[PDB]
Every structure is written in C-alpha cells, then in structure tokens.
Design a protein around this nucleic acid. Structure first.
Length: 92
DNA sequence: AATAAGCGGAATGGGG
DNA sequence: TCCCCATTCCGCTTA
C-alpha cells in the first residue's frame, strides 16, 4: 500500500488537489495544506487506504508527526500546516 | 467563550 | 514474535 509521504508527494507532482496542498519552496521541499480545504484531502487519503473510519486532517497530521523522528517529513516551526520532505524522499 | 491548531502518549489495527 | 506503518482515541496546551 502507498505510504502517506508518497501520497502527498504524488499529489504535489500531479497538481490534482491544488486548492488543498501546494509547494511553498519546492527546491527545499516545503509544502503547506489549506486551512479551509485540507479535510477533502484527508478524506481522499483514508479512502485510498480503505480505512475503517473517515480520515480527518487531525489523524493524518498525527501520522505526519511520526515522520518527524525519522526525518522523512519535518514540520516547520513557527508556521501552520507547513511541512518539509527530506532530500532523500525528493530524490525519488 | 468559540474556533483552530499544536502536541503527543497510548491503545489498537496492517501486513509481513 | 515482534517490527512496519499507520489509525484511532483521548485530552491537555497554545493561539
């Protein structure tokens, strides 16, 4: 099954949900979710995974928090809804 | 207060 | 057995 970080990177590459997620500084790998439209993207993640319950942005962000220890995705300090993929994730 | 977001331990569920 | 990769629950803190 697709991993969360790959789902998000794929969305950014395809542009399919541009009103829910966007690059802030693509060369640095920083991206941000829409305050008003992030739930639609979270719903899509849960449906793609076949999860039992409806996915919420809060639960998806709880999964993102686990990537901070490994560095796969870091949450940008002093910003809201903003994250940064590692260089390794971006190298494909 | 109302609303949003951050934080994150812990329990539970996936698929090896 | 026991790690992977989340998901779900719960509740306190900060804005």
């Amino acid at each position: 099954k697709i991993r969360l970080y790959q789902f998000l990177l794929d969305l950014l590459r395809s542009g399919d949900m541009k009103d829910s997620i966007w690059w802030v500084d693509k060369d640095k790998g920083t991206f941000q979710f829409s305050s008003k439209h992030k739930e639609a993207l979270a719903h899509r993640w849960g449906i793609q995974k076949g999860n039992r319950k409806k996915m919420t942005y809060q639960k998806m962000a709880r999964a993102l928090r686990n990537y901070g220890k490994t560095g796969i995705i870091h949450k940008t300090a002093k910003k809201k809804l903003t994250y940064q993929f590692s260089g390794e994730v971006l190298g494909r």
